[PDB]
Design a protein around this nucleic acid. Structure first.
Ligand SMILES: [K+]
Ligand SMILES: [Mg+2]
Ligand SMILES: [Mg+2]
Ligand SMILES: [Mg+2]
Ligand SMILES: [Mg+2]
Ligand SMILES: [Mg+2]
Ligand SMILES: [Mg+2]
Ligand SMILES: [Mg+2]
Ligand SMILES: [Mg+2]
Lengths: 184, 141, 307, 70, 140, 100, 221
RNA sequence: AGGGCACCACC
RNA sequence: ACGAGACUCUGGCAUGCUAACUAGUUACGCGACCCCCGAGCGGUCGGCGUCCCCCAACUUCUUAGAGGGACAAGUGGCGUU
RNA sequence: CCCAUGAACGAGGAAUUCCCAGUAAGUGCGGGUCAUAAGCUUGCGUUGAUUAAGUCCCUGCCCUU
């Protein structure tokens, strides 16, 4: 019995191109779940969040700001509608679009400000910051706009997956890496 | 065989409200177009025929849980009251609305006064609700 | 005749503390464990597994320390560290009778030859005789051991009905089952005792424990016969049902002695900076061709007597 | 941290020095022996003492130990 | 008459599933399993049946009574109780092999299907609005 | 005969249990049908108050509490026999109420 | 009819007021405490029961009368008895009152405190602490602490191993505060001290030396 | 000058 | 030796123990309603009743007592080992 | 309580608080106060995360020379 997210999206065909992030993007096999709501204790120990499914990590990061704290059912519904919109707009697997968006949004070099010095970025922090940037871009696009949060999230994910500069996450990653290069 | 618990409750409430309105023997107060349903509401109900919906909901609640009085109904239909710059609190529904709904349902003979207080469904009311549930299940299938 | 490893049973989740077999059902055995369960094994002897867990008996609150099977093979009797004995109907796997009265861990249980009596030894330094209905017929505490009663056994020869007990006071005691009164007292051992077993004929009693020496006693004569040397602590002693052998679980290994020659026949060593798993219990098959051994790695190992 | 205090360590050393022949590498048997041969007011303290006794018994089997004179 | 009654917990929500020999019925508080709200988490309830197949449940009727907690906690309690009830019924009235294989499937998918989450609300302490947060501190 | 209900209430669990056990042992010795000790939920009375007598310092609080434990025993016995059974020594702090 | 919560709180309040009244009435007589056993029997523990009883029981009859009148007992329902404290040296309240009356008698602070300390230690206590605070010498106030033996401060065992008493002495220049803490000895009997030992005290049984058998020997009974 | 500790310090 | 720790209360586990008409469950009987079809050992019932003249078993769920349970105990690695 | 009236406020400068798991935050419900009575406090559940498993850079405290 193959497990599909929301009963619609399969994980078998999802490919993670970047081998550095393959161990930190839990998307298939033992990490294929019907829903992005597990109520698991992923924060109990260090690195354990790497086992949290990437869709559920996105869902968790959507629970901002304060007024939306704890409304995980609402964020699950938002993610479901965003995946539907992504499938309509691109014809691709929304999981593949999300994986590509995260890969393209994760910054690879940063600056530590110890005058600043350039340092590398660990894969786990790459994934964390990619998710944070994607959610922040969607939220800021949806604020004070008739465009719904699901549509804004879908647009942000699609642009990040394409690598377009219309993406908030892509622009922020480019700025961070440019500053790191300057301080190198 | 279909009973109420077998169907979607929102669809059941809509179907039962339509049935009550079509039967047209339910007594409706003269002030249904003026009042709001609780002190914590800000506006009157959007639906003009809110009385039939409320009666259907009350009958369904009595089916699920008999012996409920006006106080229990006002607890059921209570909600959050926003208090301007002060925090929000729970608030109860309109006792007159609950009482008139119960009395109208009694007039339809679907509801009778319970021995231990409050109201309950008559066998006729139970039969009507089960038939409505069967219709809802047939429509879904 | 050298015994070879035939297979393993891997159901348990804790130390295998006791293994029981019955002549009626050659394909069914019982294994008690520290996971508070008793696994009834159905023996398939197939290529994949020698046997698989058929049923699990649950209801004990602490470690199950000892288990025996009734003569007809329909009921099982178990003791546990929760201080109670349980009687299990093997067909349904439910408890039919609870035996209460021991105030500490029950370390050993034993059925009589006709299954009309039950004997239990516990850490409360008391021996208890019960009937099948769960009533403590007698309690030996005055002349009993001054330390934990580690093992109690019944003589299979009805001609001289006696009970053999061993405890942590380094003593082997014999009790006249008729009156539950002391008859013989053996003062040979130098360390605490873990096990006493009785020969199928009832003539011999082998005792073993901390000192690593397996001492033989004549139940009829009431005198010490001889002593065999085991390298490690003796955890379990078992007489072969047909052959004139004595089997001892000495630490991680198993030693078989030919009582006629008083020499080692075979040494059963598991194939390996960690200490090896210890063998904790032994039980011969009904026909005497298969020896089941429990270990501290939660496994049961099957040894086949191969020509 | 899991550092055992002097109460636990000294009780374990005295128990080993006085009842070495009854102790072994099994925590549960050691715990039963400790509760039989000593008055330890609390179950948690008994468990800590028995655990350190087991650890020291493993060390003693592996070689001599300065604190304990058997 | 073959039946078991097994509970599942989540926070203060407790659900007891009565699983007896039957034809494949599953009810929660008298309602079909697909009618339990919120339906955003319907797959959480359906997970035991989806993982094990309808063939395992075809021989039993399971009725679940749930109370306490909140909506999500009740959902998790219901699914845990259903899984544990099926495991108990198999281990009691079928062989141990079937119980072991279904338990392995459930454990591999999600441990909380069989083992309860022990997390509970932490007590509030004076000097702050909650268990850890403190009231704002001013100096001048 | 008459159905006797004994309600025991205490702040000390150990003494309450000792009294209940003694009453049940007496009833057993008199060979009476006695329903075992039904344990009502424990009541926890709480008073939380500022530690300081004035209003100065860090706002620290004392959480005082009292625990009340309640037991019920049911007997089928004559009133005289029930009174004789209850006439045994009662530990201090245990309040006994007998109802017929 | 009254609820159980109110009933228990009321019984506690009655005991508190009764103890306060008896403390003020019988301070000079060695009053240490009161036990109320429900006729309602009220037992007064004191060092000098003769003064509590008075001339042919006149004072105890007066105490019974005032107690009955104040608390509304039916006439004859409440009876008062007097008993002597078993170990006067181990009662913190008794020692605090003794020190208070020594100080009221003009005795030197150091002498009185050391006398009380020596008496407590000779009575069998594990240890004691006596603190006297106030205007001991001159206008500036200070506190003198006299400690002996063992004393514990933290944890649950303080509740049943340490007996504490606080008293006020009204002197010409002001009030002196007296604090007496006594660490009771471990008493398995339970008379002079708690039965439960200190939780961190592990007592290991000395093994009985035995001779290992040289050769196997069998005996017949 | 060196070395520790703390979301009533920082990261 | 005090303080720390230990300790007391609390949280989590026990289909093992004790035992409950001021807690329930399951079973059965009666009753109400739905399905003629596939009407049943059917489904729903916080509808009633079953030690309480006499009419049913149990404690999973609830309550609360006793006891058990965890010790860095097991395995691997690091450590002066 | 009802009808009516419908202000600033579009996310907040310098500065600064609290906090790491059923925690923060959201959400309501009890107790105290109380004839009348919560924008406070003390508790309770319910929904429920991001980040970290480090350091002495800031603020402090402590130790050695
Ligand atoms: K929007
Ligand atoms: Mg509402
Ligand atoms: Mg909170
Ligand atoms: Mg101390
Ligand atoms: Mg402390
Ligand atoms: Mg600050
Ligand atoms: Mg900061
Ligand atoms: Mg229970
Ligand atoms: Mg105030």
């Amino acid at each position: 019995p193959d497990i599909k997210l929301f009963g619609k999206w399969s994980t078998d065909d999802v490919q993670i191109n970047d081998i550095s992030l393959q161990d930190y993007i839990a998307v298939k096999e033992k990490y294929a779940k019907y829903l992005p709501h597990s109520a698991g204790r992923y924060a109990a120990k260090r690195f354990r969040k790497a086992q949290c499914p990437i869709v559920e990590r996105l869902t968790n990061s959507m629970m901002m700001h304060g007024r939306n704290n704890g409304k995980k059912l609402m964020t699950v519904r938002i993610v479901k509608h965003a995946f539907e919109i992504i499938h309509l707009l691109t014809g691709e697997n929304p999981l593949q679009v999300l994986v590509n968006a995260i890969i393209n949004s994760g910054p690879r070099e940063d600056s530590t400000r110890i005058r600043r010095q350039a340092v590398d970025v660990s894969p786990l922090r790459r994934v964390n910051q990619a998710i944070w940037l994607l959610c922040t871009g969607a939220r800021e696009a949806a604020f004070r706009n008739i465009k719904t949060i699901a549509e804004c999230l879908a647009d942000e994910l699609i642009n990040a997956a394409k690598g377009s500069s219309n993406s908030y996450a892509i622009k922020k990653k480019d700025e961070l890496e440019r500053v790191a290069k300057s301080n190198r | 065989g279909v009973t109420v618990k077998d169907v979607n409750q929102q669809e059941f409430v809509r179907a039962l409200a339509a049935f009550l309105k079509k039967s047209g023997k339910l007594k409706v107060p003269e002030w249904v177009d003026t009042v709001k349903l609780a002190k914590h509401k800000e506006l009157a109900p959007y639906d003009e025929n809110w009385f039939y919906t409320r009666a259907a909901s009350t009958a369904r609640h009595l089916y699920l849980r008999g012996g409920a009085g006006v106080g229990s109904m006002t607890k059921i239909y209570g909600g959050r009251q926003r208090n301007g710059v002060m925090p929000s609190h729970f608030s109860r529904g309109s006792k007159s609305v609950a009482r008139r709904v119960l009395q109208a349902l009694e007039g339809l003979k679907m509801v009778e006064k319970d021995q231990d207080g409050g109201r309950k469904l008559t066998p006729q009311g139970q039969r009507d609700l089960d038939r409505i549930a069967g219709q809802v299940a047939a429509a879904n299938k | 005749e050298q015994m070879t490893l035939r297979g393993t049973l891997k159901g348990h989740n804790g130390w295998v503390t006791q293994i029981a077999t019955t002549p009626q059902f050659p394909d069914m055995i019982l294994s008690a464990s520290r996971d508070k369960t008793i696994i009834m094994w159905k023996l398939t002897r197939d290529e994949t597994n020698y046997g698989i867990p058929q049923r699990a008996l649950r209801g004990h609150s602490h470690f199950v320390s000892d288990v025996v099977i009734s003569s007809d093979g329909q009921f099982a009797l178990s003791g546990s560290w929760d201080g109670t004995l349980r009687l299990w109907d093997l067909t349904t796997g439910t408890t039919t009778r609870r035996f209460v009265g021991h105030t500490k861990d029950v370390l050993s249980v034993a059925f009589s030859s006709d299954n009309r009596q039950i004997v239990s030894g516990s850490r409360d330094k008391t021996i208890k005789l019960w009937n099948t209905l769960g009533v403590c017929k007698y309690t030996v505490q005055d002349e009993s051991h001054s330390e934990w009663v580690s093992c109690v056994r019944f003589s299979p020869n009805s001609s001289n009905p006696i009970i053999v007990s061993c405890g942590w006071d380094k003593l082997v005691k014999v009790w006249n089952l008729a009156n539950c009164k002391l008859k013989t007292n053996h003062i040979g051992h130098t360390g605490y005792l873990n096990t006493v077993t009785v020969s199928p004929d009832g003539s011999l009693c082998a005792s073993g424990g901390k000192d690593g020496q397996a001492m033989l006693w004549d139940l009829n004569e009431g005198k010490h016969l001889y002593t065999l040397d085991g390298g490690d602590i003796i955890n379990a002693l078992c007489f072969s049902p047909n052959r004139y052998w004595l089997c001892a679980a000495t630490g991680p290994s198993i030693k078989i002695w030919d009582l006629e020659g008083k020499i080692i026949v075979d040494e059963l060593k598991q194939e390996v900076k960690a200490e090896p798993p210890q063998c904790t219990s032994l039980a011969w098959s009904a026909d005497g061709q298969t020896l089941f051994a429990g270990y501290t790695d939660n496994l049961v190992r099957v040894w086949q007597v191969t020509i | 941290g899991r550092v055992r205090t002097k109460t636990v360590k000294k009780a374990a050393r005295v128990i080993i020095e006085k009842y070495y022949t009854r102790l072994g590498n099994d925590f549960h048997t050691n715990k039963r022996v400790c509760e039989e041969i000593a008055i330890i007011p609390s179950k948690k303290l008994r468990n800590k003492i028995a655990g350190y006794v087991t650890h020291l018994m493993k060390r003693i089997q592996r070689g001599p130990v300065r604190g304990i004179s058997i | 008459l073959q039946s078991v009654q097994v509970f599942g917990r989540k926070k203060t929500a407790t659900a007891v599933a009565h699983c007896k020999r039957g034809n494949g019925l599953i009810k929660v508080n008298g309602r079909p399993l697909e009618m339990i709200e919120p339906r955003t988490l319907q797959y959480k309830l359906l997970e035991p049946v989806l993982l094990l197949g309808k063939e395992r449940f075809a021989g039993v009727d399971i009725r679940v009574r749930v109370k306490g907690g909140g909506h999500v906690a009740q959902i998790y309690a219901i699914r845990q109780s259903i899984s544990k009830a099926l495991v108990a019924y198999y281990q009691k009235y079928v062989d141990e092999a079937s119980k072991k294989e279904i338990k392995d499937i459930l454990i591999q998918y999600d441990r909380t299907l069989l083992v309860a989450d022990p997390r509970r609300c932490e007590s509030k302490k004076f000097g702050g609005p909650g268990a850890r947060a403190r009231y704002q501190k001013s100096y001048r | 005969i008459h159905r006797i209900r004994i309600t025991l209430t205490s702040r000390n669990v150990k003494s309450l249990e000792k009294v209940c056990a003694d009453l049940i042992r007496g009833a057993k010795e008199k060979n009476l049908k006695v329903k075992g000790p039904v344990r009502m939920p424990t009541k926890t009375l709480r008073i939380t108050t500022r530690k300081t007598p004035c209003g100065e310092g860090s706002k620290t609080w004392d959480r005082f509490q009292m625990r009340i434990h309640k037991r019920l025993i049911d007997l089928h016995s004559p009133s005289e026999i029930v009174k004789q059974i209850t006439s045994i020594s009662i530990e201090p702090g245990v309040e006994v109420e007998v109802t017929i | 009819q009254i609820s159980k919560k109110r009933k228990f709180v009321a019984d506690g309040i009655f005991k508190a007021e009764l103890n306060e009244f008896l403390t003020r009435e019988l301070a000079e007589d060695g009053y240490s405490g009161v036990e109320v056993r429900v006729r309602t029997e009220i037992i007064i523990l004191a060092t000098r029961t003769q003064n509590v009883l008075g001339e042919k029981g006149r004072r105890i009859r007066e105490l019974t009368a005032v107690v009955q009148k104040r608390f509304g007992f039916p006439e004859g329902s409440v009876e008062l008895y007097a008993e002597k404290v078993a170990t006067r040296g181990l009662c913190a309240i008794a020692q605090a009152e003794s020190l208070r009356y020594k100080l009221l008698g003009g005795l030197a602070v150091r002498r009185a405190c050391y006398g009380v300390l020596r008496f407590i230690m000779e009575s069998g206590a594990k240890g004691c602490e006596v603190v006297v605070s106030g205007k001991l010498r001159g206008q500036r106030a200070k506190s003198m602490k006299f400690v002996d033996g063992l004393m514990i401060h933290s944890g649950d065992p303080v509740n049943y191993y340490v007996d504490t008493a606080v008293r006020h002495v009204l002197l010409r220049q002001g009030v002196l505060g007296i604090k007496v803490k006594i660490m009771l000895p471990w008493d398995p009997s339970g008379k002079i001290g708690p039965k439960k030992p200190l939780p961190d005290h592990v007592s290991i049984v000395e093994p009985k030396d035995e001779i290992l058998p040289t050769t196997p020997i069998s005996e017949q009974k």
